[PDB]
Structures are given as structure tokens and as C-alpha cells.
């Protein structure tokens, strides 16, 4: 009678940025997905490959809950086959993505009258991220061939840009909390089962 710690990912008081997204693994527990319905309110709920209505009658070997904060304009980028800065330099989902992406407006929690600048996103990178790859380097992006010796300027740009969430911002620029569930049934025996 061990319940999977899905709650500690959703109702958590603190969420991380998108360039430094958080991930919690799930294993050896009963995954009851009733909280995905009739609980609070979700602005976005896009499942790929799996039907959540049947998630209660399945068992998986690997389950991962990723969590971060973006803005509305970017919640569409959290999907397989998406482009842009978020899908290239921050958080990318593979083409054969088999999970779900949930997102809810958190303008009442992640917005201050003076502007919340604790949520950053990566702006420059040498190459695109591979599926489920996290980069937290603060090195000045050497845009050219001249070495940026810790000083910004021409062809020397800081890689992280602040969101600046404000309460008077439009819904497209308001903070949305995003949780991505990823299910994998590999050669190992499945342990993350649902009530069956």
C-alpha cells in the first residue's frame, strides 16, 4: 500500500526554472492517477502515446516527473517536434514521446509587484539539446572566435535571460507551471503499476 509521490511534484510550494528543470523518478509504488482529474484546474493537458484513462490499468518500468516554470507563449513548445529557444536550449522532448504534459497558470504564486526575476531561461547555446538533457552552465556564450575572458560585450553574451513575470502581464506572459510525466516500459521488470 505504497502510493507514488506524485503529490510532492504538483502541489509543491517552489518550482524551478526551465533551463534548470527538476526531475523526480518514480519506482516501487502504486500510481493512482485520479488526481489528474477533478483536482484544481489545468490550463493545458496534452498526452502523447498514452491514454491517461487507461493509466490506472498499466504498469511501467520507468516513470519520470519533470517540473519547471515557463510562460504561456511557450507552453506549446513543450511537445515533440517543437522548435524555438525553449525546445532547443532548455527542455526537449523526443519524437517518440510517450507521456503527458500538464500546465496550469501560476500568476498568483510566481509573480510579484516588483517583478519576479528568479525564473531564468537559456538564451544561447552551441548546439541543440538532446532529449532529456539539462544544461546549467553559466559560461559567457562565446559567439565569435575571440575568447570571452569572463567579460561580456561584442560576441560575448550572458546565456541566461530573465522572464520578469509581472501580475499585470497578459496571459501569454504570465507564469505557467508545467509538469511532464514520462512513461517507459523497457526490458527491466515493471514496478510503477496502477490500481488494477
Amino acid at each position: 500500500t505504497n502510493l507514488c509521490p506524485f503529490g510532492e511534484v504538483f502541489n509543491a510550494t517552489r518550482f524551478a526554472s526551465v533551463y534548470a528543470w527538476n526531475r523526480k523518478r518514480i519506482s516501487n509504488c502504486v500510481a493512482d492517477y485520479s488526481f489528474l482529474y477533478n483536482s484544481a484546474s489545468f490550463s493545458t493537458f496534452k498526452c502523447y502515446g498514452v491514454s491517461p484513462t487507461k493509466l490506472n490499468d498499466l504498469c511501467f518500468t520507468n516513470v519520470y516527473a519533470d517540473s519547471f516554470v515557463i510562460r504561456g507563449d511557450e507552453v506549446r513548445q513543450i511537445a515533440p517536434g517543437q522548435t524555438g529557444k525553449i525546445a532547443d536550449y532548455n527542455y526537449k522532448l523526443p519524437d517518440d514521446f510517450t507521456g503527458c504534459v500538464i500546465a496550469w497558470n501560476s500568476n498568483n504564486l510566481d509573480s510579484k509587484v516588483g517583478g519576479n526575476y528568479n525564473y531564468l531561461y537559456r538564451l544561447f547555446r552551441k548546439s541543440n539539446l538532446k532529449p532529456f538533457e539539462r544544461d546549467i552552465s553559466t559560461e559567457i556564450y562565446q559567439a565569435g572566435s575571440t575568447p570571452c575572458n569572463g567579460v561580456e560585450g561584442f560576441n560575448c553574451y550572458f546565456p541566461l535571460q530573465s522572464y520578469g513575470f509581472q501580475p499585470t502581464n497578459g496571459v501569454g506572459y504570465q507564469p505557467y507551471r508545467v509538469v511532464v510525466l514520462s512513461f517507459e516500459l523497457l526490458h527491466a521488470p515493471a514496478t510503477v503499476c496502477g490500481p488494477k
Epitope: 489528474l36 482529474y37 493545458t44 496534452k46 517518440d96
Partner: antibody, heavy 119, light 114 residues
Framework: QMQLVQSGTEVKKPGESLKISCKGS????????IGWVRQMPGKGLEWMGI????????RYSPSFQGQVTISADKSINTAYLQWSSLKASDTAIYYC????????????WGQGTTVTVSS | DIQLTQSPDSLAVSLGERATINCKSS????????????LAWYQQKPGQPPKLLIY???TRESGVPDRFSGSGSGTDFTLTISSLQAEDVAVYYC?????????FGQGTKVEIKR
């Protein structure tokens, strides 16, 4: 569970717009992608398109790219299939089917609307 | 684009006999993440909308009898009806939900062989 109700049968003349509706009611509609499919007098089922009512993410079949439009109103849990000055080749029955995911088989089907287009 | 063709156009099977319908895809519809074939079989009777008979090429729906079985992997799949009853007279389609756009099969019409 999930249930989809479609509009009544329409009879129209060639050259008039039309908007078929598909309203959903059931458990957890926020996860359902609504897809439109055509069946002409005869035997074929041809996938027209799909849309997620959360945002406006719409995907069209290459045979229905510029001929039809697919919209959605999330406030009342409805999808819409719209023609503008349609032709006499559109006389058919149109179904809307719901799938709890994008790459999920169509679990719940509607009743289908009969569109009759004749001069 | 993925294309599906159903081998038997028409299928005349006597009452209580086995009926087989074949579906051949132009591409593989197997997901690496869960190793499941993304193919479904639907059934529609005259006048009614099509109901999802089976999904994942093998898994039966919550509301289907045990005579409707699905097998196959890769690109060849089979829908088998063990004891064909008078209710089973309908048109059966195979569709793929692997990638957009979705594609239905040709449509196999079954009948009680009198």
C-alpha cells in the same frame, strides 16, 4: 465516461457556409483531442483532421488542407468544422471522435451529422 | 503518409466459423518507448457510427466479446472472429494512430455465408 453529441442534419445549397458542432460531456474532457472524419454515400472512412480544445493546435489531412477549417470553443467543450461556400461533393455523414491523447485511438464517437448539398 | 490495405475486400463466412481480416502497413507502427504496435480495429454496422473494436493491435476494448481477437507485429496484422454471429455482420476497418495524418483501411465487408 465520455460522450460526444453532434448537431442536426443540414441541407444546404452549393455556395453557402456551414458550421458543424460537436459538444463533449463526460469525465475529464480536458484530455480529449476531437477529430473529424468523413464518410460519403458508400463505404469509405477518410480522416479529415484533429484538434485539441485546450489551445488551438489543429492538424489537417493533406486532402482537407484548404477546403475545411477546424475550430474549438473550450468554454462549452465544443469542436467545429466549417465550410465556406461548399460544393456538391460534400454531401456525406461527418463524425467527430474523441481520443484521450493525440496518438491514442478514437475511443468515443459521435452520432454523425448528415450534410446534403444540392442545387 | 502511412498506407493500409485490407487483403479481403469481401468476406463470406458461415455462421459460427472463423473470419480473418488482414491489414498491411507501408511502415512500422511500433513505438520504441513501450514496444506496442499503434494500430486499431474498428467495426461499424449499417446506420451506426464505428465503435473501437480493439486497440494496440492486440488489446481488446472494455466492451467487446472474446471472439474479436487481434494479432500481428511490424507491418502485418490480423483481426480474427472466432464464432461469427448474426451481430458481427458489419464493415471492419484498420487504422493507424502512429503519426499524423491518420489513415483508415479499405474496409472489409463481412456476411453470413448462406
Amino acid at each position: 465516461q465520455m460522450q460526444l453529441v453532434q448537431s442536426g442534419t443540414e441541407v444546404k445549397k452549393p455556395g453557402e457556409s456551414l458550421k458543424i458542432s460537436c459538444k463533449g460531456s463526460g469525465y475529464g474532457f480536458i484530455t480529449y483531442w476531437i477529430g473529424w472524419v468523413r464518410q460519403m454515400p458508400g463505404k469509405g472512412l477518410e480522416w479529415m483532421g484533429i484538434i485539441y480544445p485546450g489551445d488551438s493546435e489543429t492538424r489537417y489531412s493533406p486532402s482537407f488542407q484548404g477546403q475545411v477549417t477546424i475550430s474549438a470553443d473550450k468554454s462549452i467543450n465544443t469542436a467545429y468544422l466549417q465550410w465556406s461556400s461548399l460544393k456538391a461533393s460534400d454531401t456525406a455523414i461527418y463524425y467527430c471522435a474523441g481520443g484521450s491523447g493525440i496518438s491514442t485511438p478514437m475511443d468515443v464517437w459521435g452520432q454523425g451529422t448528415t450534410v446534403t448539398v444540392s442545387s | 503518409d502511412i498506407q493500409l490495405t485490407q487483403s479481403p475486400d469481401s468476406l463470406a463466412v458461415s455462421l459460427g466459423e472463423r473470419a480473418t481480416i488482414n491489414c498491411k502497413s507501408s511502415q512500422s507502427v511500433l513505438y520504441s518507448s513501450i514496444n506496442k504496435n499503434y494500430l486499431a480495429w474498428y467495426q461499424q454496422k449499417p446506420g451506426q457510427p464505428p465503435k473501437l473494436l480493439i486497440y494496440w493491435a492486440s488489446t481488446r476494448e472494455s466492451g467487446v466479446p472474446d471472439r474479436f481477437s487481434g494479432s500481428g507485429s511490424g507491418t502485418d496484422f490480423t483481426l480474427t472472429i472466432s464464432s461469427l454471429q448474426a451481430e458481427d455482420v458489419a464493415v471492419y476497418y484498420c487504422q493507424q494512430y502512429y503519426s499524423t495524418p491518420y489513415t483508415f483501411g479499405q474496409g472489409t465487408k463481412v456476411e453470413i455465408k448462406r
